[PDB]
Design an enzyme around this catalytic site. Sequence first.
Site, PDB file in Angstrom:
ATOM      1  N   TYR A 194      -4.824   8.766  -1.582  1.00  0.00           N
ATOM      2  CA  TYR A 194      -3.094   8.897  -1.480  1.00  0.00           C
ATOM      3  C   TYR A 194      -2.408   8.804  -2.203  1.00  0.00           C
ATOM      4  O   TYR A 194      -2.971   7.910  -3.180  1.00  0.00           O
ATOM      5  CB  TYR A 194      -3.041   8.198  -0.399  1.00  0.00           C
ATOM      6  CG  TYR A 194      -3.916   8.207   1.898  1.00  0.00           C
ATOM      7  CD1 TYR A 194      -4.059   9.366   1.882  1.00  0.00           C
ATOM      8  CD2 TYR A 194      -4.883   6.722   1.238  1.00  0.00           C
ATOM      9  CE1 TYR A 194      -4.427   9.250   2.972  1.00  0.00           C
ATOM     10  CE2 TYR A 194      -6.280   7.237   2.787  1.00  0.00           C
ATOM     11  CZ  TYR A 194      -5.793   8.182   3.419  1.00  0.00           C
ATOM     12  OH  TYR A 194      -6.859   8.193   4.739  1.00  0.00           O
TER      13      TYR A 194
ATOM     14  N   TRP B 254      -8.428  -1.532   0.501  1.00  0.00           N
ATOM     15  CA  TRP B 254      -9.310  -0.954  -0.144  1.00  0.00           C
ATOM     16  C   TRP B 254     -10.133  -1.906  -0.460  1.00  0.00           C
ATOM     17  O   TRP B 254     -10.807  -0.821  -1.694  1.00  0.00           O
ATOM     18  CB  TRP B 254      -8.821  -0.195  -1.068  1.00  0.00           C
ATOM     19  CG  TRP B 254      -7.644   1.246  -0.168  1.00  0.00           C
ATOM     20  CD1 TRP B 254      -6.452   1.150  -0.351  1.00  0.00           C
ATOM     21  CD2 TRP B 254      -8.388   2.158  -0.176  1.00  0.00           C
ATOM     22  NE1 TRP B 254      -5.814   1.616   0.740  1.00  0.00           N
ATOM     23  CE2 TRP B 254      -7.019   2.479   0.519  1.00  0.00           C
ATOM     24  CE3 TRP B 254      -9.478   2.768  -0.039  1.00  0.00           C
ATOM     25  CZ2 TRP B 254      -6.658   3.645   0.936  1.00  0.00           C
ATOM     26  CZ3 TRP B 254      -9.332   4.423   0.143  1.00  0.00           C
ATOM     27  CH2 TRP B 254      -8.204   4.330   1.203  1.00  0.00           C
TER      28      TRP B 254
ATOM     29  N   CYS C 246      -7.438  10.075   6.115  1.00  0.00           N
ATOM     30  CA  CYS C 246      -7.326   9.628   7.518  1.00  0.00           C
ATOM     31  C   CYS C 246      -5.972  10.504   8.122  1.00  0.00           C
ATOM     32  O   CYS C 246      -6.456  11.187   9.327  1.00  0.00           O
ATOM     33  CB  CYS C 246      -7.838   8.556   7.731  1.00  0.00           C
ATOM     34  SG  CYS C 246      -9.540   7.598   7.489  1.00  0.00           S
TER      35      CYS C 246
ATOM     36  N   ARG D 166      -7.152  12.318  10.716  1.00  0.00           N
ATOM     37  CA  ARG D 166      -8.271  12.863  11.746  1.00  0.00           C
ATOM     38  C   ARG D 166      -9.587  12.191  12.581  1.00  0.00           C
ATOM     39  O   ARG D 166      -9.480  12.064  13.485  1.00  0.00           O
ATOM     40  CB  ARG D 166      -8.573  13.029  10.619  1.00  0.00           C
ATOM     41  CG  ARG D 166      -9.428  12.448   9.555  1.00  0.00           C
ATOM     42  CD  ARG D 166      -9.822  13.761   8.362  1.00  0.00           C
ATOM     43  NE  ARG D 166     -10.315  11.998   7.489  1.00  0.00           N
ATOM     44  CZ  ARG D 166     -11.146  11.152   7.593  1.00  0.00           C
ATOM     45  NH1 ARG D 166     -11.965  11.168   8.918  1.00  0.00           N
ATOM     46  NH2 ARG D 166     -11.826  10.234   6.359  1.00  0.00           N
TER      47      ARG D 166
ATOM     48  N   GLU E 160       0.858  -1.381  -0.120  1.00  0.00           N
ATOM     49  CA  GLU E 160       0.097   0.475   0.050  1.00  0.00           C
ATOM     50  C   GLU E 160       0.724   1.492   0.073  1.00  0.00           C
ATOM     51  O   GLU E 160       0.511   2.245  -0.820  1.00  0.00           O
ATOM     52  CB  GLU E 160      -1.073   0.150   1.400  1.00  0.00           C
ATOM     53  CG  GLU E 160      -1.447   1.434   1.586  1.00  0.00           C
ATOM     54  CD  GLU E 160      -2.562   1.898   2.954  1.00  0.00           C
ATOM     55  OE1 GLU E 160      -1.825   1.213   3.760  1.00  0.00           O
ATOM     56  OE2 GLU E 160      -3.530   2.349   2.993  1.00  0.00           O
TER      57      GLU E 160
ATOM     58  N   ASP F 244      -8.635   4.574  13.782  1.00  0.00           N
ATOM     59  CA  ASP F 244      -9.414   2.785  13.456  1.00  0.00           C
ATOM     60  C   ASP F 244      -8.113   2.023  14.338  1.00  0.00           C
ATOM     61  O   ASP F 244      -8.012   1.899  13.930  1.00  0.00           O
ATOM     62  CB  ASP F 244     -10.112   1.995  12.778  1.00  0.00           C
ATOM     63  CG  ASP F 244     -10.699   0.921  12.553  1.00  0.00           C
ATOM     64  OD1 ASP F 244     -10.593   0.706  13.820  1.00  0.00           O
ATOM     65  OD2 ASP F 244     -11.690   0.056  12.063  1.00  0.00           O
TER      66      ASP F 244
HETATM   67  C1  LIG Z   1      -8.487   2.119   3.491  1.00  0.00           C
HETATM   68  C2  LIG Z   1      -9.448   1.947   4.735  1.00  0.00           C
HETATM   69  N1  LIG Z   1     -10.853   2.413   4.499  1.00  0.00           N
HETATM   70  C3  LIG Z   1     -11.504   1.942   6.262  1.00  0.00           C
HETATM   71  N2  LIG Z   1     -12.391   2.332   7.170  1.00  0.00           N
HETATM   72  C4  LIG Z   1     -12.482   1.426   8.480  1.00  0.00           C
HETATM   73  N3  LIG Z   1     -14.261   1.619   9.450  1.00  0.00           N
HETATM   74  N4  LIG Z   1     -11.487   0.931   8.979  1.00  0.00           N
HETATM   75  C5  LIG Z   1     -10.026   1.066   8.280  1.00  0.00           C
HETATM   76  O1  LIG Z   1      -8.649   0.523   8.720  1.00  0.00           O
HETATM   77  C6  LIG Z   1     -10.109   1.249   7.134  1.00  0.00           C
HETATM   78  C7  LIG Z   1      -8.952   1.515   5.726  1.00  0.00           C
HETATM   79  S1  LIG Z   1      -6.946   1.223   6.424  1.00  0.00           S
HETATM   80  C8  LIG Z   1      -7.263  -0.586   7.155  1.00  0.00           C
HETATM   81  C9  LIG Z   1      -5.684  -0.951   6.989  1.00  0.00           C
HETATM   82  C10 LIG Z   1      -6.016  -2.628   7.666  1.00  0.00           C
HETATM   83  C11 LIG Z   1      -6.811  -3.441   7.457  1.00  0.00           C
HETATM   84  C12 LIG Z   1      -7.033  -4.853   7.364  1.00  0.00           C
HETATM   85  O2  LIG Z   1      -7.260  -6.063   6.243  1.00  0.00           O
HETATM   86  N5  LIG Z   1      -7.020  -5.423   9.076  1.00  0.00           N
HETATM   87  C13 LIG Z   1      -6.968  -6.433   9.251  1.00  0.00           C
HETATM   88  C14 LIG Z   1      -6.732  -7.579   8.408  1.00  0.00           C
HETATM   89  C15 LIG Z   1      -5.037  -7.422   7.861  1.00  0.00           C
HETATM   90  C16 LIG Z   1      -4.602  -8.691   6.408  1.00  0.00           C
HETATM   91  O3  LIG Z   1      -4.237  -9.218   6.442  1.00  0.00           O
HETATM   92  O4  LIG Z   1      -4.755  -8.372   5.274  1.00  0.00           O
HETATM   93  C17 LIG Z   1      -6.324  -6.433  10.448  1.00  0.00           C
HETATM   94  O5  LIG Z   1      -5.189  -5.806  10.565  1.00  0.00           O
HETATM   95  O6  LIG Z   1      -6.205  -7.072  11.832  1.00  0.00           O
HETATM   96  C18 LIG Z   1      -8.287  -3.286   6.787  1.00  0.00           C
HETATM   97 CL1  LIG Z   1      -9.750  -3.895   5.784  1.00  0.00          CL
HETATM   98  C19 LIG Z   1      -9.002  -1.663   6.402  1.00  0.00           C
HETATM   99  O1  LIG Z   2      -5.784   4.719   6.966  1.00  0.00           O
HETATM  100  C1  LIG Z   2      -6.947   4.920   7.816  1.00  0.00           C
HETATM  101  N1  LIG Z   2      -6.467   4.574   9.066  1.00  0.00           N
HETATM  102  C2  LIG Z   2      -7.915   4.820   9.405  1.00  0.00           C
HETATM  103  O2  LIG Z   2      -8.053   4.534  11.209  1.00  0.00           O
HETATM  104  N2  LIG Z   2      -9.133   4.063   9.237  1.00  0.00           N
HETATM  105  C3  LIG Z   2     -10.159   4.173   9.211  1.00  0.00           C
HETATM  106  C4  LIG Z   2     -10.801   5.377  10.193  1.00  0.00           C
HETATM  107  C5  LIG Z   2     -12.920   5.751  10.225  1.00  0.00           C
HETATM  108  O3  LIG Z   2     -12.666   5.417  11.189  1.00  0.00           O
HETATM  109  C6  LIG Z   2     -13.166   5.337   8.007  1.00  0.00           C
HETATM  110  C7  LIG Z   2     -12.870   5.863   7.740  1.00  0.00           C
HETATM  111  O4  LIG Z   2     -13.104   7.609   7.373  1.00  0.00           O
HETATM  112  P1  LIG Z   2     -13.987   8.389   7.917  1.00  0.00           P
HETATM  113  O5  LIG Z   2     -14.339   8.955   9.783  1.00  0.00           O
HETATM  114  O6  LIG Z   2     -14.267   9.915   7.729  1.00  0.00           O
HETATM  115  O7  LIG Z   2     -15.160   7.669   8.034  1.00  0.00           O
HETATM  116  O8  LIG Z   2     -11.435   4.903   8.058  1.00  0.00           O
HETATM  117  C8  LIG Z   2      -8.764   3.886   7.824  1.00  0.00           C
HETATM  118  C9  LIG Z   2      -7.413   4.932   7.004  1.00  0.00           C
HETATM  119  F1  LIG Z   2      -7.481   5.096   5.683  1.00  0.00           F
END
Ligand SMILES: Cc1[nH]c2nc(N)[nH]c(=O)c2c1Sc1ccc(C(=O)N[C@@H](CCC(=O)O)C(=O)O)c(Cl)c1
Ligand SMILES: O=c1[nH]c(=O)n([C@H]2C[C@H](O)[C@@H](COP(=O)(O)O)O2)cc1F
Lengths: 505, 505
Positions: free
Chosen positions: A326, A300, A386, A407, A278, A410
């Site tokens: 980004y 994504w 974010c 901002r 990424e 998660d």
């Molecule tokens: C791009 C994006 N949009 C999001 N929306 C919400 N509500 N929360 C988010 O973290 C994000 C993100 S960033 C993000 C970072 C890691 C993952 C992710 O795959 N997490 C899991 C699986 C990791 C893996 O093996 O790929 C984990 O860490 O346990 C995800 Cl789905 C999204």
């Molecule tokens: O790098 C990241 N880290 C992260 O925490 N989010 C989460 C934060 C939020 O809970 C969600 C959506 O952003 P928003 O608060 O504008 O709905 O994506 C997204 C990323 F790309």
Amino acid sequence: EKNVSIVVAASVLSSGIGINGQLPWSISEDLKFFSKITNNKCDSNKKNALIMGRKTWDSIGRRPLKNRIIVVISSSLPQDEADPNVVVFRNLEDSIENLMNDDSIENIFVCGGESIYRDALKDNFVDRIYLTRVALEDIEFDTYFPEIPETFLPVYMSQTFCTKNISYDFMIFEKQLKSIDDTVDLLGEIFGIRKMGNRHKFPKEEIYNTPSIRFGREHYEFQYLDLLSRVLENGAYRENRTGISTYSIFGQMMRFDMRESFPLLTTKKVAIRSIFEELIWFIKGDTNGNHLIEKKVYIWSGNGSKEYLERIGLGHREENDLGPIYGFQWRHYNGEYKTMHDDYTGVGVDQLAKLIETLKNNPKDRRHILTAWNPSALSQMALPPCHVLSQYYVTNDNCLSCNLYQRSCDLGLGSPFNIASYAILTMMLAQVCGYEPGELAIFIGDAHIYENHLTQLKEQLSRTPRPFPQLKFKRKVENIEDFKWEDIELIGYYPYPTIKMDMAV
Amino acid sequence: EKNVSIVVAASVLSSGIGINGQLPWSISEDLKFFSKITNNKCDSNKKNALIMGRKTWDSIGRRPLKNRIIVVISSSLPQDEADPNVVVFRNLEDSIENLMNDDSIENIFVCGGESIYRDALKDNFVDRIYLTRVALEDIEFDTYFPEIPETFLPVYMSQTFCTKNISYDFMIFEKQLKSIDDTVDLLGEIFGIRKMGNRHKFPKEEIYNTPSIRFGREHYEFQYLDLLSRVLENGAYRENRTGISTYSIFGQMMRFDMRESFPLLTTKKVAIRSIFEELIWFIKGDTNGNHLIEKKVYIWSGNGSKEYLERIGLGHREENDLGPIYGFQWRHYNGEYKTMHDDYTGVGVDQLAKLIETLKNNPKDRRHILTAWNPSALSQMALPPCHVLSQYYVTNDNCLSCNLYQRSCDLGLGSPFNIASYAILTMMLAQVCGYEPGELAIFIGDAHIYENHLTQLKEQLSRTPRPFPQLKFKRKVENIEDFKWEDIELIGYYPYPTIKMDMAV
Ligand SMILES: Cc1[nH]c2nc(N)[nH]c(=O)c2c1Sc1ccc(C(=O)N[C@@H](CCC(=O)O)C(=O)O)c(Cl)c1
Ligand SMILES: O=c1[nH]c(=O)n([C@H]2C[C@H](O)[C@@H](COP(=O)(O)O)O2)cc1F
Ligand SMILES: NC(=O)C1=CN([C@@H]2O[C@H](COP(=O)(O)OP(=O)(O)OC[C@H]3O[C@@H](n4cnc5c(N)ncnc54)[C@H](OP(=O)(O)O)[C@@H]3O)[C@@H](O)[C@H]2O)C=CC1
Ligand SMILES: NC(=O)C1=CN([C@@H]2O[C@H](COP(=O)(O)OP(=O)(O)OC[C@H]3O[C@@H](n4cnc5c(N)ncnc54)[C@H](OP(=O)(O)O)[C@@H]3O)[C@@H](O)[C@H]2O)C=CC1
Ligand SMILES: CN(Cc1cnc2nc(N)nc(N)c2n1)c1ccc(C(=O)N[C@@H](CCC(=O)O)C(=O)O)cc1
Ligand SMILES: CN(Cc1cnc2nc(N)nc(N)c2n1)c1ccc(C(=O)N[C@@H](CCC(=O)O)C(=O)O)cc1
Ligand SMILES: Cc1[nH]c2nc(N)[nH]c(=O)c2c1Sc1ccc(C(=O)N[C@@H](CCC(=O)O)C(=O)O)c(Cl)c1
Ligand SMILES: O=c1[nH]c(=O)n([C@H]2C[C@H](O)[C@@H](COP(=O)(O)O)O2)cc1F
């Protein structure tokens, strides 16, 4: 009564301490630590006694340590009255006569020997334990360190240090004014939420990672775990754009060291490959989500789906065209975005290039800034930034430090990925500009935990942290866009099992 | 031996405690504090004795306080054996028989009377002092609190509280494990700059503001002063764009309460009018420096001068045309800047308006962001954004919190101005969107002190902080740009004298 402490360097997992009559590692800083921790005393007229096994006594070449009295436990070694610095006892119990007699001893240390450690614990003679965890387990051991009984509790955990690409920690295990506290409590009773101290309540023991470690929480994974606890404690249950509500607090920060380690969480197995992929996906300025899916990276996917795009008013957009997100703002700021297939060469403002060039041509500048927040392009983006804005700093000793403002965070999914991502990015910028990694400070706005991650993160909090791994590049590149996954070497990463958590789309 | 504490509410400066046989204020929280601090005990079978003067005994209407024993000092009042809760002694010394006899008393408190306070201090009978500093001095007093002798040292200073627009503090004056510390010190000896803890050394006593207050540094001016100490301690001496070099550290933060006070520094008299005028100058989107100079505000004089402009490659620019700086990016983002005379109405992206609209139409949103960093316009700006990006947060109890990231911070000039400016801005956004002020978190990148501000800031550190003032608006406006200086009321601001410091152009 006199204090008897145990000094030992064991492996992180299996607690191995030796192999074939010698150490399975060579860490000078560790031996120095032993030297200083055994030479530590108050009375100049007194010395410290060092209890060790016969085989350990053979391991050190049978030569005494300066300013210390080595006590050898052996059933064969004759009571040598010649050397006044070394003494031999027949059993461990009789060896500890330093309590009742010989007032020339101030402190007693058990320095080594599994056979000695085990019956020093079994007969309960140890008050304190100085454990030096070492991060390597894919080797051979024949001598282990006995499992610490429940009568001991950790009170200190140093930051992760590195020697010869080997990570290690320093831990202490202990056998276990009122006026100000009372006044603050009373003020907390009179004023309610008015008192800001009551708005930032200290996390309870039930949700505090390793509660016994109070003043010695030096490890920098605690910067994340204690944040997790803080959001778990003061988190206001609120709704958002997704159907999953979050517990949220506002205004937080996390500090990290990158000089002697790599801020990758050990309490949970983090998918590092997806993070890197990424990151370089950003660096190239690529906005095509499919390129991530082709490389088996599905982070994504939810924010890329056709349904999500049509829902946010981007139905004209392709299946995985995320828009000017980004990278596009890094390489083509204020660039008129069409589709992900168009060639945006030469257009927009290349923030990354100017960032590197400024970093190496003018290090002491205070304008090293990379932003992604573009009000003119926010409407076109599939998801607003974010990790919004970052600033870089070149120290006097040629180190590269990175500050990142986020901002929305998660703490279940986004946070570790962000930490690792900007750590790797900082290291890349460091190598390209000819510097070394420094410190990573992440300032968080809306720090929140989704309600479907509760049991998972509370499970993660039940895991005592392990030393951070090391990240090394196998080759030096000329362009930052030339980094490959094969060029990344992650050394000494032994994390807790992965924790499955669902993403709120 | 028994503990004897003094409880007293005095004014901040002249330490007045009474007027015409009564209190010069009415603070329920203060009286409640008195009640709780005097009712605090361990043994249920014991009570607390309250020593007070005859006139003070008249002040409370001559009625006993529940669960306490009032001791009246008088040479005329007869020894009333009727009421078992009130007792009269002829002198203060004889009054302290609670030590030698009557084991039914657990604690002793001196509750009031200048004639009592003064000779309770003079004869040295007091162990602790509970001082409630009150922020009003333009009134009349006839009874004062005696100056605290050097035998006492402050150990606590609460945050500034507000009742009926009156600021007040709570302070405590006192008459005055090794293993972890030793381990950390030893690790600090082994590893040098490698250990991150040694890169962030705790400030020395010589540069630590009010060193006696160790665990009770609750006042939020300490968030700034301790930062000043930290940069004064670990500050790397480095150069910059100006001829004046700075001592700099990277990655810091300061927290502030705006609910019960207003984060305006008291250790130095800060020009609040200039701050406000600059703020509304931003809000209007004005870039004309003369408009600020016409109102006798010269903070943008040096960065506006013809010499400075011609020096930074803007010789074509007018005498005080600062270019697309703050405000222009707030109201007209990505707008093509010509001169300061052109009418940029309707052009660019109005971030401020959309910010307000989003704040009131969608409070739980996580995109409440106002930025000023525009890479496309940086070359035209007289000075790139220091307070770069801000994010706003509406809490569940309808409060407005503000986070601000600052790439570069002048701890001598810029910092207080930034704190106060974004505080006032947060309050404005709160009133316009129909909320109340909450908290202010400022995350700082390059926190530095110019070498010509050393003696001045070291002078500022020698001043014990006073309670933060209050900020109230005299009228509610319909548009945020309609705010006037006459609409601002600053209540209870009694700062230390101003400290003259020159700006590095
Ligand atoms: C791009 C994006 N949009 C999001 N929306 C919400 N509500 N929360 C988010 O973290 C994000 C993100 S960033 C993000 C970072 C890691 C993952 C992710 O795959 N997490 C899991 C699986 C990791 C893996 O093996 O790929 C984990 O860490 O346990 C995800 Cl789905 C999204
Ligand atoms: O790098 C990241 N880290 C992260 O925490 N989010 C989460 C934060 C939020 O809970 C969600 C959506 O952003 P928003 O608060 O504008 O709905 O994506 C997204 C990323 F790309
Ligand atoms: N990582 C670390 O901190 C340390 C690691 N090590 C490593 O571990 C290994 C050493 O440990 P280990 O293999 O267990 O050997 P030991 O050092 O524990 O052997 C101890 C010896 O002491 C004597 N002894 C032990 N117990 C008794 C008893 N109850 N009564 C009488 N005599 C006793 C015996 O000698 P005898 O034959 O005379 O009876 C025994 O061989 C080495 O490889 C060493 O390098 C060692 C120290 C520290
Ligand atoms: N802000 C705060 O926390 C407090 C403020 N106050 C204010 O302070 C004012 C009162 O204080 P103040 O004017 O000094 O009067 P005092 O409260 O000190 O009362 C004095 C009286 O106590 C007796 N007394 C005092 N000293 C002696 C002595 N050495 N020997 C014998 N008797 C003695 C005398 O009574 P006698 O006539 O019998 O000789 C004297 O008149 C009030 O306005 C009150 O509101 C009071 C308490 C707390
Ligand atoms: C085999 N052995 C046991 C050993 C090895 N590593 C350990 N590591 C730790 N963390 N704790 C121990 N008790 C420990 N013990 C050794 C080997 C060498 C020295 C040693 O050379 N000590 C010198 C070190 C010299 C120096 O670095 O200045 C000293 O002055 O104490 C000590 C113990
Ligand atoms: C005249 N006087 C002296 C007085 C006034 N203000 C002070 N303020 C402070 N900070 N400290 C003092 N010692 C103090 N003393 C008074 C006046 C009222 C009460 C009073 O009402 N006490 C009740 C308080 C009731 C309540 O507010 O809940 C109690 O239960 O003790 C006490 C002392
Ligand atoms: C706009 C600007 N440019 C700066 N350049 C450098 N090197 N450092 C800076 O702080 C700045 C600033 S912000 C700023 C804020 C307050 C002042 C200022 O006038 N301070 C005065 C009081 C305010 C007044 O009355 O003008 C003082 O503290 O003695 C100034 Cl000069 C500049
Ligand atoms: O609000 C401000 N606060 C501040 O501290 N500066 C200082 C920071 C820096 O020392 C100087 C110039 O910034 P730079 O680091 O780009 O030279 O202005 C300027 C402001 F407008």
